[PDB]
Every structure is written in C-alpha cells, then in structure tokens.
A paper describes a structure:
Asparaginases (EC 3.5.1.1), which split L-asparagine to L-aspartate and ammonia, are grouped into three unrelated structural classes: Class 1 (bacterial-type), Class 2 (plant-type), and Class 3 (Rhizobium etli-type). ReAV is a homodimer with an α/β protomeric fold, formed by two tightly packed domains. The active site of the enzyme is located in a cleft on the protomer surface and marked by a zinc ion with an unusual coordination sphere created by Cys135, Lys138, Cys189, and a water molecule. The conspicuous catalytic center of the enzyme comprises two Ser-Lys tandems (Ser48-Lys51 and Ser80-Lys263), centered around the curiously hydrated Ser48 residue and located in the close vicinity of the metal binding site.
The introduction of alanine at position 139 resulted in only minor atomic shifts and structural rearrangements in the active site area, almost identical in the four protein chains. The substitution of His139 by alanine does not affect the conformation of the neighboring residues: just two water molecules, marking the sites of the two N atoms of the imidazole ring, fill the available space left by the histidine side chain, maintaining the original pattern of hydrogen bonds in the active site area. The fully occupied Zn2+ binding site is conserved in the mutant structure, as are the catalytic Ser-Lys tandems. In the close vicinity of the Ser48 hydroxyl, high difference electron density peaks were detected, previously also observed in the WT protein structure and interpreted as three closely spaced water molecules. Therefore, a water triad was modeled forming very strong H-bonds with the Ser48 Oγ atom, with O…O distances of 2.3–2.4 Å. Despite the mutation of the highly conserved His139, the H139A mutein retained the L-asparaginase activity. We also could not titrate the H139A mutant with Zn2+ because, as revealed by the crystal structure, it is already fully saturated with zinc. Intriguingly, the side chain of Cys249 did not undergo oxidative modification in the H139A mutant structure either, in contrast to what had been observed previously when the zinc cation was present in the WT protein structure.
Residue numbers in the entry:
A (entry chain A): 4 to 353
B (entry chain B): 4 to 352
C-alpha cells in the first residue's frame, strides 16, 4: 500500500512518486495491485476508447465510412504530426464538416520535435491540431448522424454527451452517480471513476478481441470493442506518434495488447489471453491501469514498463524496445551519468 | 504527518504532492514544520550561496574585482538571457580565462521564452550559457588564486571542492559525514543534508545582513555572508531572470529577504529580522526551506507563496506580485478554467 518509484542522484534520494495500479480479469476481478487500486481517478484520454464506442454505436455513424485508422485517431492523444492533421481533415470531409465546427482548441504539441518545428515556423496551432481532434470529429459525426445540433456537441446536456456518459458508466459496470465528471483540456466532459474500473474497460477491449478472433457469438457492443482494439493495434502511430510510448509499446507487442496514456499520468493496457496471462492465474484477457499520484509522465512510463516485466508480459527482447522509458536517462551536461530510477515496490496478489 | 498540495478538476482530485518544510531561527532551532523537516535532501542550486561563500573566502579572489552583480551570478540559476551570458564572458576576462576552461555544459534555457528564441535561431548553448555558469567562473577563479591547477577545478579531490565541502558542512553545523555528495547537472559535486539545515544556511545569511546593517563587528565569514545577501537582493535579475520566481520574489520584498530555487523542487529563503519574524516567536533572522517530494516546480512556487502568507511575511500588497504562482492558472484550450490548487497542509509549531 506504500508503493513508490524513486529517483536518485549518486544513490541519494532525489524524488519519490506514489504508484497506484490495478490488474484485473475480464470481469473486473482484482488480481494484483499497487497502492490503492480503487483510487477515484480522472481517466482523461485513457477514457477515449469508451468515448469512441459511444460514437460508433450512434445511429447512422456507420454510413460515414470511418476506417480503422480513423477509429485509431478517435482513440488518440496524437502528437499533431502532419499525418494526424491530414487524417483529421479527411474525417471532417467524411461528415461534410469544417474545422470551424470543431469545439476543441490548439495547444503545444505533445511531441517536442513537432513543437520545435512549429516554433521555428512561427506556427500557431488551431483546433484541427488538438491531440483530441479525432475524438472531436467523432463527436461531431455522432451529433450530425442523429440530426442533433452540432454547435454544442461538447456540452454536457447535448444528446451526444448523454450517450458518452451512459456508455462510460456501462463499460465500468457502475451506476451513473458513481461516475463523476469534470471538463477536459479539449473542453469536453471527462470522467472520474475507481482506477480498477479503468483496467476493467481495457480488459473488456482485449476480451472482445479474443472473442472476435475465436468466432464467438458477440453482441454488437463486443464486436465494436473488438474493432476498437484492432484499430488501435493496427494503427498505433495514429494513437500517439513517432517516438511516443503508446506507439512503441503497441508496435513492440504486434497485436498482443493495446495501451493508452491519460494526461496527469494515468495509463491503461488491455492484454489478450496469452501464456503470460494464464501464468498469472486467469483464463481470459486482462486489464492494467496505473496512476502516478503526483502526475509525472516520465515515472509513469518507467513504472508501466517495470510492471510488464514483473507480470511477464512479452519477452525480454520485445520489452527491450522500451528500454529508454524503463530506465530513463540521467546524464548531465558533460555526458556523465548522475543517477537512476528504482522500483522498491512489490506487487500484491489480491 | 499528511501535508499535501493538491490540484483538482471540477472539485475532483487530479494530483497530490507531499510537502516538507522547515522554518528555523538564526541558530537553526526549529520553529515550524510541514512534513518531515529533517528529510535528507539534495539542495541542488539552493546550495549556491554556500558555494559562493567558499569562492569569496578563497585567498586572492578579491584581487579579480568581481562586483555585486558578478556575485549574484555566482549565486544564480539564471535563464541564460543575453545579459547573463555576457556577464559570464566578462567574468572570464577578469580571471584571464576562456570558455574552454569551464567544466560545465550548455542545456536548454530554464526560461521558455529564451528557449523559444534559441529554437528559432538554431542556437546551440555552450558552457557560458549554463544556468551554473557564474558558479563555474567563480570556482575557476578560486582555483587560479590557489595556484595548483585549473583543469580539474570541478573534481572532488581538487582543493576548490575540498573548500566547498568544508564550507557547506560548517554552515550546516554538521560533521562531514552527515553531508552526502552527488554530481550536479553542471558536473560539480552537490550536497545533501537534512532539510532544516538548508533553512539554517539562509537564516545565517539574513542574520549576517542584519549585523552588517547594524554596524556590528563581524568575523570575515559573517562579512562575506552579508555581502552575498546584499548582492542577491540588489541584483535579483542575475539570480534568475525576467518572469522568474526568485527574481519577482526578491524584487517584491525589496531587501527584506533573499530566496533561491533548487532543481527538483527545493526552495530556500532567508528573512531579515522584522515585525513578522518577531510575531513568529524569534528575536533574530529566520530561514525557510521547502521540498516537494515528487519534484514538481509549479507546486513548489504555489506552496512557498502560501507559506509566506501563512507566516505573515510581507503584506498582501507585496505578496500579490506572486499571485500567478500562488494560484496557478488552470485554463483549457478554449479559455475555460477547469480547476485549481489547494493547500491541505497544516503548519505545526
Ligand atoms: Cl495516416
Ligand atoms: Zn480530450
Ligand atoms: Zn551547478
């Protein structure tokens, strides 16, 4: 319950960060934990697959012809690379909308390399550049498809947001009153719920992929969840971008899992059934959710990668692709290694 | 104890950050605390006034003619503004040295506005651009004055670093073995010691300033501490830069205190004796030191400003120049405020 990731300088403690984590089975039963696995947590962008489900289940959205890469962008916190802007624009054209219809705003890119190119060009990002631009187009598409107004598609009382709110609570297996709502950076409602339920959503994503693969009689919702999983795993560069953790993680695993960042250092992973998950004592898919209490992203990726190693998910060779995130560099202005990162926590079985 | 600073989104907890703080008198006695006031803590750049004391006490350094603004730069984590870089180069000429003699490296500017300008220009920062460049020149100056060699002035076995290590321990009133050492971003040794002792250093700085102003006879060390305090308070723009917390804090207080940032979210302040310090129960100067356990700088500045308010240091008018740091903006991409910062901590005496 007192689980930390700790950085040091010469073996002297620099910073410490409290970790919360839940590892759950396909029905949401808690298998392993760090910290408080039920911590009430703002899922932020890690809720995007659930919002994408609400979009995909909206009557008429199928008629726009969104493809897997478009769905991956709905699920993205992308780096605002030119390819992400181009896909956003292509999605707007599918619904006969324009950039002025977006209700999210521009921001500095999540990628330092993109941001430096923008600074060099004096480029001011606009709505089409938002990391949430794919979700925004999807919400616009849903509003248009049912003949709702589009001007306020992001407002809490709009029917698209009522659909989102209902869909999030159903995927979490929670009553409406057990999900709290704030406003996100992109100006949409954003949910908070117990951390283990974030893992449950991702377990359900990977379980649906397994059941699609196995040729089971799936509900339309399970079919849609399987589609979302497949889309993210097939187009992981749309979900984040070059050099980004989510993209590198999903590329290394080549369809065995999906992963997604939430702002302020949450992370979620859906893991398809494998020899590794069977060794962990479950017969189906699993979900992992993590929150770093103080919000540090570098520590989040270090911890997530350490957790994958402790859980035996992947091979050493596969996980070696994430080495730069697992043990972040601590090299000073003269090339000297001054410190490191340590994981003095123990996963508890529960 | 459970002392935190917390951010929320619509009243829903986002992040929480553990706070440690010590408020000490001029002899280091603990008056108030948050968290663990004796946490072993890397002082990082908050140690720079102690390193500047080691430089200024090196025999021969007075002959180079460093002025108060040069001393303030020795005490700095500057933003690498053109005035900082230029002063570093001017300081090198005072000691007949070149940039190739420095043993620190460049890095992206601590100021976003400066760094944006560098990106637009394809500027590559070099040693004189380091936020620690003034300290580096001072260490090189002391090595030149000693006469034993300058190539390794930054190495632990060099007499300049032996002087630094002894001086830090003496100011903390610690045995050498109770101060631990790592290596800083600039490649110099950097000390760790209990957090309250960082407060003690800054209490001694302010106390020396009080004695000097009152005309008391002082030891050579106290006279040098008073000089460091004066230099920081007279040239706060050299200590950090435009828009930076340390500069805005020291300007607002107009000589009543000095403050300094350490990397990974430590902060130290030395407060000259005043009605406010007397209300806190001490008859001399005060020191304050703070560490945010997880290293978040935005939260550090919010907590330091909140602590000054709780201690009654300044006036609402003086502290209001720090309002942007006290309650950081939480405005989204559409201009809407989405939450804020709160301070569920409780000072203990
Ligand atoms: Cl594409
Ligand atoms: Zn968003
Ligand atoms: Zn330094």
């Amino acid at each position: 319950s007192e689980d930390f990731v700790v950085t040091d300088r010469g073996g002297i403690v620099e910073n410490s960060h409290r970790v919360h984590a839940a590892v759950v089975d396909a029905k949401g039963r808690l298998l392993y934990a760090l910290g408080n696995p039920t911590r009430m947590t703002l899922a932020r962008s890690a809720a995007k697959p659930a919002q994408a489900l609400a979009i995909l289940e909206t009557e008429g959205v199928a008629g726009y012809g969104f493809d897997d890469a478009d769905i991956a962008l709905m699920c993205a916190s992308h780096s605002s690379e030119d390819r992400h802007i181009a896909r956003t624009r292509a999605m707007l054209s599918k619904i006969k909308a324009e950039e002025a219809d977006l209700r999210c705003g521009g921001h500095p890119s999540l990628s330092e390399m993109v941001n430096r190119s923008w600074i060099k060009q004096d480029f001011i990002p606009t709505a089409v550049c938002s990391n949430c631009s794919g979700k925004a187009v999807g919400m616009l598409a849903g509003a248009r498809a049912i003949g709702a107004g589009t001007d306020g598609y992001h407002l809490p009382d709009h029917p698209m947001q009522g659909r989102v709110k209902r869909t999030v609570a159903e995927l979490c297996d929670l009553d409406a009153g057990d999900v709290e709502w704030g406003t996100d950076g992109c100006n949409l409602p954003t949910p908070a719920f117990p951390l283990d339920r974030l893992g449950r959503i991702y377990a359900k994503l990977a379980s649906a992929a397994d059941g699609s693969d196995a040729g089971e009689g799936q509900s339309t919702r399970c079919a849609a969840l399987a589609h979302i999983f497949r889309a993210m795993a097939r187009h992981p560069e749309m979900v984040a971008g070059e050099g980004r953790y989510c993209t590198m993680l999903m590329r290394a695993f080549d369809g065995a899992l999906v992963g997604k960042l939430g702002a302020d250092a949450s992370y979620a992973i859906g893991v398809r059934a494998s020899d590794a998950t069977r060794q962990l004592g479950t017969d189906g898919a699993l979900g992992i959710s993590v929150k770093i209490e103080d919000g540090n992203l570098e520590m989040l990726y270090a911890v997530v990668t350490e957790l994958l190693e402790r859980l035996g998910i992947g091979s050493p060779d596969v996980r070696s692709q994430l080495a730069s995130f697992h043990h972040p560099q601590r090299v000073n202005t003269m090339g000297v290694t001054t410190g490191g990162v340590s994981f003095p926590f123990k996963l508890r079985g529960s």
